[PDB]
Design an enzyme around this catalytic site. Structure first.
Site, PDB file in Angstrom:
ATOM      1  N   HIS A 188      42.623  43.497  38.075  1.00 12.37           N
ATOM      2  CA  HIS A 188      42.041  42.207  37.583  1.00 12.37           C
ATOM      3  C   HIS A 188      41.433  42.440  36.211  1.00 12.37           C
ATOM      4  O   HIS A 188      41.531  41.592  35.320  1.00 12.37           O
ATOM      5  CB  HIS A 188      40.949  41.657  38.562  1.00 12.37           C
ATOM      6  CG  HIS A 188      40.387  40.269  38.142  1.00 12.37           C
ATOM      7  ND1 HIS A 188      40.999  39.469  37.174  1.00 12.37           N
ATOM      8  CD2 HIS A 188      39.295  39.504  38.603  1.00 12.37           C
ATOM      9  CE1 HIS A 188      40.298  38.305  37.079  1.00 12.37           C
ATOM     10  NE2 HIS A 188      39.269  38.264  37.927  1.00 12.37           N
TER      11      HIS A 188
HETATM   12  O1  LIG Z   1      38.553  34.878  38.657  1.00  4.28           O
HETATM   13  P1  LIG Z   1      37.261  35.533  38.222  1.00  4.28           P
HETATM   14  O2  LIG Z   1      36.416  36.260  39.244  1.00  4.28           O
HETATM   15  O3  LIG Z   1      36.917  35.626  36.744  1.00  4.28           O
END
Ligand SMILES: O=[P-]([O-])[O-]
Lengths: 103, 103, 103, 103
Positions: B76
């Site tokens: 991520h």
């Molecule tokens: O989707 P996010 O935790 O920035």
């Protein structure tokens, strides 16, 4: 059913908090719909929320979001409640913001 | 996890801010403000550098949970960081082109 | 999984089509067709918006299989979507430059 | 794993070299050397093509460890390859613009 919308950059790390809040809302029969979105949609999606909650990382954006949605209660999620992923606690704060708003 | 998860959120936000600054830098260029554009790119670069440094640590010590397996969130952060860094570099090139366009 | 997997395929295809349209939009610009370029960009954006919306849901409810862990394919869709969206935005900038180049 | 892990390193390095060549290709364009730029892009493309081919095999036979689950590193290679390929394509467009700029 009231709409509680949470914002963050992509809508993930807050996604885990949203799933725990939904569990709590079901357990206590609270008539709410909870959704997580990236901060880029705060102005587009916020128009349909009954209460707008901002993740702790985007607290600095509070004044801008308030001007964007002058007819909606907007507030930042408590950082401790958020870090701990307290679904019940955040659900309580959201319902409160709605009540304190309708009176 | 606790920090790693909160850290990723910070990285995602940081990466997002970096891109935001980059696009803003480009916008300055369109207005013919090379000085402001240059300043914005520099800050954007610094933001990424700090973000990249944090990720570097997150990749060097990605071990702990298991042998072969690593923290899932590493992606991520990598995905957002890689995209943001690349975007900025290209935007920098685009800004340079605006300068060559004379305007 | 069943849908999630088939959904990812759709997202990947959608993301791919989006890029395809974006590059095609750029090609139109090279031919000096700003009107067609603009129209193609708009459609590409709409395609991405719908794709992003679907992903948003896929990130908000990424829970179910496990607590900390999430659907692996989420990344595949994110990677393709992030790349396509970024490419399209940059391509838009490139097209604007073609317009400034007069041609 | 043994090869897959070492292969990913090769892919990451290859992807990195590809980008490096691409940026170098762009630099040549800035110097007004369209011939060298063109040659560099061609080699970059070939490098990516070979890298992509290897990844294709790594995705077709991604099974083995488990049914639904796949090699985690697949993403690592995909992320780098996708970013490099996209960057190179955009850089190619940027180089073409330099050519249109006359210079
Ligand atoms: O989707 P996010 O935790 O920035």
């Amino acid at each position: 059913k009231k709409h509680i919308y949470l914002f963050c950059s992509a809508g993930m790390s807050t996604s885990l908090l949203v799933s725990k809040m939904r569990a709590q809302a079901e357990k206590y029969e609270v008539p709410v719909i909870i959704e997580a979105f990236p901060e880029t949609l705060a102005g587009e999606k916020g128009q349909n929320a009954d209460v707008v909650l901002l993740g702790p990382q985007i607290a600095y954006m509070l004044p801008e979001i308030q001007r964007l949605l002058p007819n909606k209660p907007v507030e930042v999620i408590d950082s401790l409640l958020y870090g701990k992923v307290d679904g019940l606690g955040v659900l309580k704060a959201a319902v409160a913001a709605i009540k304190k708003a309708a009176a | 996890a606790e920090e790693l998860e909160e850290v990723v959120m910070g990285l995602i936000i940081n990466s997002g801010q970096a891109r935001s600054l980059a696009y803003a830098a480009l916008k300055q260029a369109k207005q013919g403000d090379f000085a402001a554009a240059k300043a914005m790119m520099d800050q954007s670069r610094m933001a990424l550098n700090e973000a990249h440094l944090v990720q570097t640590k997150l990749i060097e010590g990605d071990a702990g949970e298991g042998k072969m397996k690593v923290s899932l969130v590493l992606v991520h952060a990598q995905l957002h960081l890689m995209t943001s860094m690349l975007a900025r570099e290209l935007i920098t090139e685009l800004i340079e082109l605006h300068e060559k366009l004379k305007a």
